[PDB]
């Protein structure tokens, strides 16, 4: 009768921002003031819905992607940048919250931690809630490149390279974005 928040908020390893998880959460009775009363999160802000009074009033999804610390400005409705245009764009009528906490002791190692990537270049901006997992080479303006890269043709992905002792703006924040979506349907997840 509960939700799997022990697998979303406490996974051992998150995914990259360009290929973000999304787990449909249904058949629940959910207590949203469990995490809100914990307050171990640097960001917890519920847009549209009333925060901490939302334990009473169809389904919710749960995104999972870890970005650098100063990139949490983009995880909001109506942002631009290298995350809200090319990796994960929230819609204009979002109803839910972004939860981010400084996970520096977990997701970074001595030397580099080149597992988490992002998409520097892309031909157009994302429609809201759309992934892009392609790794074709991005030409800039003119010259076609058949799977090859050089001048004027770049590999689209680029790593973060998390050092354990970077600045506080460049550190892995594990971002979980809950999207509350009510539809013309019988509900399976509500508050107790």
């Amino acid at each position, epitope marked *: 009768n509960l939700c799997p928040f022990g697998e979303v908020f406490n996974a051992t390893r998150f995914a990259s921002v360009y290929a973000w998880n999304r787990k449909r959460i249904s058949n629940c009775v959910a207590d949203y003031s469990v995490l809100y009363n914990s307050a171990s999160f640097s960001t917890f802000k519920c847009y549209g819905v009333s925060p901490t009074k939302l334990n009473d009033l169809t389904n919710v999804y749960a995104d999972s992607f870890v970005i650098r610390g100063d990139e*949490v400005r983009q995880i909001a409705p109506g942002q631009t940048g290298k995350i809200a245009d090319y990796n994960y764009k929230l819609p204009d009528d979002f109803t839910g919250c972004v939860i981010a906490w*400084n996970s*520096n002791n977990l997701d970074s190692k001595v030397g580099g931690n080149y597992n988490y990537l992002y998409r520097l270049f892309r031909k157009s901006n994302l429609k809201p809630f759309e992934r892009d997992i392609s790794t074709e080479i991005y030409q800039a303006g003119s010259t076609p490149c058949n799977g090859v890269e050089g001048f004027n043709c770049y590999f689209p992905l680029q790593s973060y390279g998390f050092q354990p002792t970077n*600045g*506080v703006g460049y550190q892995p924040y594990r971002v979980v974005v809950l999207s509350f979506e009510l539809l013309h349907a019988p509900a399976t997840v509500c508050g107790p």
Partner: antibody
Amino acid sequence: VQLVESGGDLVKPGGSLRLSCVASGFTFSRHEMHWVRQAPGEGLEWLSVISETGGTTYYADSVKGRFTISRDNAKNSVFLQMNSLRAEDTAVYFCVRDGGDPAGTVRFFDYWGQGVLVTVS
Amino acid sequence: DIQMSQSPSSLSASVGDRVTITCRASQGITSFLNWYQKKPGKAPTLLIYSSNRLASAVPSRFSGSGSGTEFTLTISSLQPEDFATYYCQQYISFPLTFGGGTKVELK
């Protein structure tokens, strides 16, 4: 390079106080500017940090929830909006400039501020 | 976090000797430690960074070393303008933790 604090006063426990360390002599929006304190008779102790865009912060265990670090990159100043000032917050409050690129494996404190005295009584 | 603990409490000898100062640790900070120099009454100053590399405008008298948990600052040739207190600082993990301070004094 010069960092000038402000906001020195005497604190009755529970009041509201705000410091302001105006920085000068360098481009301000490219370093993390933050606060280290020292109680009299006690060694130094780290207090807070804030990023190069005011985007994020990280406090210590003792001061988490009570304090708030901030900055305005046009006014070239860093602040410390303090609340719930206990009895043990009678110290000198330095404002520090980590020198190093924000992205580097090197974190070090380049230029300190002189430090203003705030007494909690 | 990692609790840095200097040794000894204080130091004093004749001017011109080779004095030493250490900054031990509890958990591993793989050669990061900064040393700061604080004279009583003014702001502290950066002495060396990354436990080897000297800072800007620091003269070549002081030199550091160390690896892993055991660290050491070497006061090589004592000048008379150095009787002060020194703080060691690690940065491998938040929250940042300074040393207790080792007070050196001229005789």
